[PDB]
From a paper:
AE1, a member of the solute carrier ion transport family 4 (SLC4), mediates the exchange of HCO3− with Cl− across plasma membranes. Mammalian erythrocyte AE1 is a ~100 kD integral transmembrane glycoprotein consisting of an N-terminal cytoplasmic domain (CD, residues 1 to 360 in human AE1) and a C-terminal trans-membrane domain (TMD, residues 361 to 911 in human AE1).
3D classification using the C1 symmetry resulted in three major classes that differ mostly in the position of the CD. Two classes showed fully connected CD and partially connected CD respectively. 3D refinement of these two classes yielded 3D reconstructions at a resolution of 6.3 Å and 6.9 Å respectively. The overall size and shape of these reconstructions suggest unambiguously that they are dimers of full-length AE1, each with a PMAL-C8 buried TMD and an associated CD. Both the TMD and CD dimers have an elongated shape.
Residue numbers in the entry:
A (entry chain A), B (entry chain C): 420 to 707, 720 to 747, 775 to 909
C (entry chain D), D (entry chain B): 67 to 190, 194 to 212, 228 to 263, 270 to 362
Write the structure that this text describes.
C-alpha cells in the first residue's frame, strides 16, 4: 500500500544516513581495516535474521556512537602494544558467545530493575560531549596536516593519500561541514515551525538530514579542481584493503601470530561491551523478554567472526516484512561505491556533530545544568524545581558534573582506558546507597523520576 | 563624570564603526578619489559646527547608505561619458547652496506634513536589498578576479594592486566576512538574551559591532603570509592619491577642463540629493524647525568644496560638549592610518551586510511580507491584521512589491539611472490619491498608521 | 422606565428564526407565559452563574455610547464593526450574525400565532445540548411611560461557532422607536451572544442584565456613562449591594425579615 | 455536629498574634460578641464575594483526606508539604506560616483577659488596609454535645506576602481533641489565607465556609469524600440550591413568604 511504500523508503533513509557516517568514522580511526561496507553487510544480515525471530520485529538494530567509542579505545590499546585488533576482537566475540549461555541457562536481566534516570542521562550527555570533542579534534588534525602557508608545492600525488599539504583544503572542508550543520539546524527549526500546512512541512522535515546532505555533494561535484578527503570504497563484494583482511579470518592470525597469553586474556573487554549493549537495549524498550536480548547478544558475538562491527538497537504481520525490506535495501546499498566515493568526509563530520547536538538537546539534565547559570528569577515552572530548594538541585548537578569530569579525564588518559564502563557502572550503587543517605526520598522522587 | 566618560567613548565607537566601512566602500567604488579620511574630516568638522549651532545638539550627523548609492550612481553616470566627477559634484554643491536661500526666504518643510509610513518603510526595505545585492556582487567580483585554479604564478607583485590571481584569497576572504557576520549575529542574540545580569550583558552587547571586528583583524595579523585586500591609507593630512586630487580644487578642472555645457546642467542631481537628505532628516526627528534643516543642507553643500562627501543625520548644557567631544575624537581618528592599513576589506563588507540585515529586521512591512507566505492559521495577533481580511493586506503588499521591483529594475539599468528618487517620490501622491480610491479610510488607518 | 428582553427563538409554525420577548420591566418584572399572557408583576431574582459570567463579559464588554444610529440595520452594522475592531470576533461571522441581527421580532399578540417557542442556538439553527431549562420565573409567576421612561431592549441568543460569549451595549444619541410594539422610544440596547457553555443560562443572564439596568441609579449612570469604566464601577457598587442567600437545611421566615435591615443598608450604600 | 471558626488576631494586652474564635455552629450559628457573650442563635447569611472567592479557591483548593495526623504540628507540617507540593506556595514562606500555624488559641473565657481583638494581616504583623471590617453579624445578633457533633475547626487569616488566597482542608483518619475547649474531637479542619484583595472579607469568607460545612448533606459528602471532585460537586449542588436576594426599592414581607416554597424546592433538590 502507498502508506507502506512511503514508510519503507523513509525508514531506509533513516537507517542508511547514520550508517554512512559511522562507516566513514571507522575508516578514519582504522587505517583501512573497517569501513562502511563491512558494517553495512553486518546490519544487512542483522535486520533479516532479527525480523524472522523477534518478539518485536518492528524494532530497528542500528549502530550507536558508544560502540564506536569502545572500538576506538580498543584500537588505541592495541596500538599501545603489538597486537592483532581483528583476531583479538574475534576472541572477544568467542568470550561473548560462551558468556551468552550463562544467561540463557538462567536470566540475568535483574539489573533492568536497577537502572536509574540519573545514570543514563549523564551517560548520554557524556557521549554527546565526546562526539563534540572528537569533531573539534578533527580540526586540529587538519590544521596540523595542512599548516597555513602561501607557497605550498605543485602537482603533489594525492590519490591514495595527500603526500603534502595543499591549498584550498584546510578551510574549504571547514566551510563544507559548517554548511552541513547550519542547513541541518535550519531544516530542523523549519520542521518545528509553522511554515506550510502540517503534512506538507513535516514530510520534508522528517527527511531533513537525508536531504541536507546532497547539496554539499553537488557543490563538491561542481568544484572538482580541488581534492577533498572522500570515501575509499572498494569494488562490490570486496573487503576494504584485502591485503590486510579477507572474509575468511584465521584465529591464529593472517600476517602475525596472535599471542597465546592474549587468547584467554580477552575476556575482560567482552563483559564491558556486553554491559554497554545491555544498558543500551532497555532505553529503546521504553516506547511501550530475555529471548530477544540474548538473541541480540548472540548476533553481536557472531558479527565479529568475519570481521564486522556489532550493531545496536534503534528506533521504530507486516512487521516482519518491514524489517525484511529495510535489511535487503541496506544490503543492496553496498553497490553504490563508485558514486559514494565522491562524498567528502567533512560532510559526515558535520552531520555527526549535528546528530550529537540534537541528541544533547533532548536531555533535561542539560536543561537544569544551564538553568544553574540562569538567574533564580525566571526559571520555567517544572514540577521538580518549584517544590525543591534551588541550591539542593545545584548540589545534585555538581555531583553529576564531577562524575562526568572524572569520566572525561579517564577518557583523556591513554594508558588507563577501556575502564570507562566499570567506573560508570559503579555509579549506580552510589545512586542506590550514597544518594538516599544525603537526600530525602521525596526529594529524590523528583530529579531521577524516570517515566 | 564617569557617566559622561562612558557615554563619550560609547558614542565615539558607534560613530566611528560605520564610518570605516563607508570609507572603505567609497575607496572601492572610486579608483582612489574618495576614501575614509576625507569623509572622516568632513564629519569631524560637521560635528563641531553643528554642536555650536543646533536646536538639538545631542543629535548625531553620520552617514547613510542611500547617500553612497546616489554617489555611486553619479560615479557610474560620469563613467558613461567623459566627465570630471569631483568638479561636477562641486557644481552640484553650488546648486545646493543657491537652492538653500529659496527655502531660507520662505520655509519649504510643508512636505513633512505629506510623508507616509508606506513610502519610507518600502524605501528602507529597498535600501537594505541593495546593500545585500552589492555585498553579493562583490563575491562575483572576487571569483572573476581570482578564478579557481591549482597552479597560479609565483612572486606576483601585489603592493599597489594584485597583478594576477593568487591562491588563498578567493575563499579565505569569504571565511573572514562570514565569520564577521556570524559573530555579529551571535553577539546581537547574546545581547538580547538572558546571559549575565542585566547591565553586565547589555554593556558589551552595545559594543558587539565595535568588538566583533578586532578578532578577525587579529586573525589576519597572525596570518600575514597571504595578502588580503586592505586599506590604502595615505599619511596624515594627505589626500588619497594626491596626483588625482588636492585640498584646493579648481572649478575649471585640475587635469581636464570641465565642460561649460555641464556647468549650468548640474542642477538636476542637486535637487535629488536635497530631497533624499530632507526625507532622511524627519525620520531621525521622530524620537521626540527649518533652521536646523537648512543648516544641515548648507553644511552638506559646503562639504563638497574641498572634495568630501556629505553626511546625514543619525541617532543620539553638556549636549554641546558631547558633540564637541565626538567630533574632535573623529578628527583625531585620522592618525591611525598605519595600523588601519592592516585591516582587510572583507571585514568591512561583512559588517555592512550585518548592518543591512539588522536594519531590515526592524521593518514591519517585511514581517507582513513573510507572513504572506505563512499559512493563514498561526498569524500573531497584531492590531492591524485581525480586523482586516488577509487577501486585502496581500493586495497592499503586492502593490509595495511591484513598486520595489520597478525600482530595482531601474537600478539595474545603467543608461537610465539617477531617476530613482523621482520615481520613488511620485509614489507618495499615489498613496494620497490612488490608495484612498481603492481602500476605505478605516482600512488604510491600520497599515500605514505612522506613530 | 421600560425595559423589554427578547430571546432568539424559532417558531414551530413557520420554522423561522426570530426574536421573541420573554419578559418586560415597567415598574416591576412581568414574565411572559408560554402561551401567551404575561405573568404577575414581581421583584426579580437571579442565579449565581448568570451574574458571574456577566461580570466576566463586562470585564471585556463592548459599549457604544453616542451611537449615531436610528434603525436596527444601522446600529447592527456599527456594533459588528466595533466587535471586530475590539478583536472580539472575526470578520467571517459578521454576515450570519447580521442575518440574526435583522430577524423578525414577535410579540405577545403573535404568541398564539406561532406553533411554539423553543430555545435556538445559531449554527453554521439547532437547540442547546447542555442541560438547561426549565425557566424558573415561568414556573413561579406564569403558573405608564409619559417620558424619562425611555425604552431599553435586550437581546439574548446562543451561537456555538463563537469562541466566547460577547456582550454588546449601545446608547443611541437619541431614543428611537424601531420595530418596540409600545410607543416608547429606545435609547439603550444590549445584545448578549456566545457558544453553549457550562453554567451559562442565557435566560437567567438576560434577566440579570435587565435587573441590573432596572436599577434607578444604574439608569442614571447609563445616562451619564462616559466610558466602560463608569459602567464597570456602577456594576461593582451594584455587586457590593448584593446579598447571596446560601441553601439552608432549616428555613425560618423569622431569620428572614432580619436581612431586611441589611437590605436597607445595602440599598442606602447603593444610593451613595 | 459542632463547627467553630477562629480568626488570626492580636490581643491588645499581650500584643501577640493568636487565634481567637469568632463564631460557633451547634445546631445554629452563635456569633461571639466583644464584651457581650455568644450572640443569639440564628440562621447564617452570606455575601456574594465571599462565595465567589470561595468557589475560585475551591477550583484549585487543597484537600487532605484520612490524614495520619493527631496534633496541630503534624497536620500543620503535612499541609505545608502539600501546599508546596501542589505549587500553591513557595517553600520560603512555610516557616513564618508555620509560626502562624502554631500560635496560641484564645477562647471566649479569655476575651475579657485580652485588651482587645482586631484583625491582623501577616507581614514580613499589621492591619488590613482595604475598606473592610463589614462582618455585619455582630451588628445584627451580638447587639455539651459529643454524641454526633464531630468537631470541625476553621481558621482564617490574611497574609499580604502571599500571591493568592489559599484554601486548605484536612480530613483526619480519626477525630482528635487538640488545643478545642469543648470535649468534641476534631476531624475536619480548614485553613483559609491570602493577601488583602478587593471584595475579600475573610470574616464573611470564613462564615461562608462554616455555613457550607453546616450542611447536613455536605457533612455526609465530607465523611464520604474520596477526591476534591466530590467536594466540588457537593459545592455546585449547594450552589444550585442558593437563591440571591437583589436589593429592592419596595420591600414587602408578602413578597417574602413566597420564596419559602422556592426555598423548599431548593432544599428538596439539595437532598437529591
Amino acid at each position: 500500500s502507498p502508506q507502506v511504500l512511503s514508510a519503507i523508503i523513509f525508514i531506509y533513509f533513516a537507517a542508511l544516513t547514520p550508517a554512512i557516517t559511522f562507516g566513514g568514522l571507522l575508516g578514519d580511526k582504522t587505517e583501512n581495516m573497517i569501513g562502511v561496507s563491512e558494517l553495512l553487510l553486518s546490519t544487512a544480515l542483522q535486520g533479516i535474521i532479527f525480523s524472522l525471530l523477534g518478539a518485536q520485529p518492528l524494532l530497528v538494530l542500528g549502530f550507536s556512537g558508544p560502540l564506536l567509542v569502545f572500538e576506538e579505545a580498543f584500537y588505541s590499546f592495541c596500538q599501545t602494544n603489538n597486537l592483532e585488533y581483528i583476531v583479538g576482537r574475534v576472541w572477544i566475540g568467542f568470550w561473548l558467545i560462551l558468556l551468552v549461555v550463562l544467561v540463557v541457562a538462567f536470566e540475568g536481566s535483574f539489573l533492568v530493575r536497577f537502572i536509574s534516570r540519573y545514570t543514563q542521562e549523564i551517560f548520554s550527555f557524556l557521549i554527546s560531549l565526546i562526539f563534540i570533542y572528537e569533531t573539534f579534534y578533527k580540526l586540529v588534525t587538519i590544521f596540523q596536516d595542512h599548516p597555513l602557508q602561501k607557497n605550498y608545492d605543485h602537482d603533489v600525488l594525492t590519490t591514495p593519500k595527500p603526500q603534502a599539504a595543499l591549498p584550498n583544503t584546510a578551510l574549504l572542508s571547514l566551510v563544507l561541514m559548517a554548511g552541513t550543520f547550519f542547513l541541518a539546524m535550519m531544516l530542523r527549526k523549519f520542521k518545528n515551525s509553522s511554515y506550510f500546512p502540517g503534512k506538507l512541512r513535516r514530510i520534508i522535515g522528517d527527511f531533513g538530514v537525508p536531504i541536507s546532505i546532497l547539496i554539499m555533494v553537488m557543490v563538491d561535484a561542481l568544484i572538482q579542481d580541488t581534492y577533498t578527503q572522500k570515501l575509499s570504497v572498494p569494488e562490490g563484494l570486496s573487503v576494504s584493503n584485502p591485503t590486510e583482511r579477507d572474509w575468511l579470518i584465521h584465529p591464529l592470525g593472517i600476517r602475525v601470530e596472535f599471542p597465546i597469553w592474549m587468547m584467554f586474556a580477552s575476556a575482560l573487554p567482552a563483559l564491558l561491551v556486553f554491559i554497554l549493549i545491555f544498558l543500551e537495549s532497555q532505553i529503546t524498550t521504553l516506547i511501550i523478554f530475555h529471548l530477544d536480548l540474548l538473541l541480540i547478544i548472540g548476533m553481536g558475538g557472531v558479527g565479529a567472526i568475519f570481521g564486522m562491527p556489532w550493531l545496536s538497537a534503534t528506533t521504530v504481520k507486516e512487521q516482519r516484512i518491514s524489517g525484511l525490506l529495510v535489511a535487503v535495501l541496506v544490503g543492496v546499498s553496498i553497490l553504490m561505491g563508485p558514486v559514494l566515493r565522491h562524498i567528502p568526509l567533512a560532510v559526515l563530520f558535520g552531520i555527526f556533530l549535528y546528530m550529537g547536538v540534537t541528541s544533547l538537546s533532548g536531555i533535561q539534565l542539560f536543561d537544569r545544568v544551564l538553568l544553574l547559570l540562569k538567574p533564580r528569577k525566571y526559571y520555567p515552572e517544572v514540577p521538580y524545581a518549584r517544590r525543591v530548594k534551588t541550591w539542593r538541585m545545584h548540589l545534585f548537578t555538581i555531583t553529576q558534573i564531577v562524575c562526568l569530569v572524572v569520566l572525561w579525564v579517564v577518557r583523556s588518559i591513554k594508558q588507563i582506558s577501556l575502564a570507562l564502563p566499570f567506573i560508570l557502572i559503579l555509579t549506580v550503587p552510589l545512586r542506590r546507597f550514597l544518594l538516599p543517605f544525603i537526600f530525602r526520598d521525596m526529594e529524590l522522587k523528583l530529579l531521577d523520576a524516570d517515566d
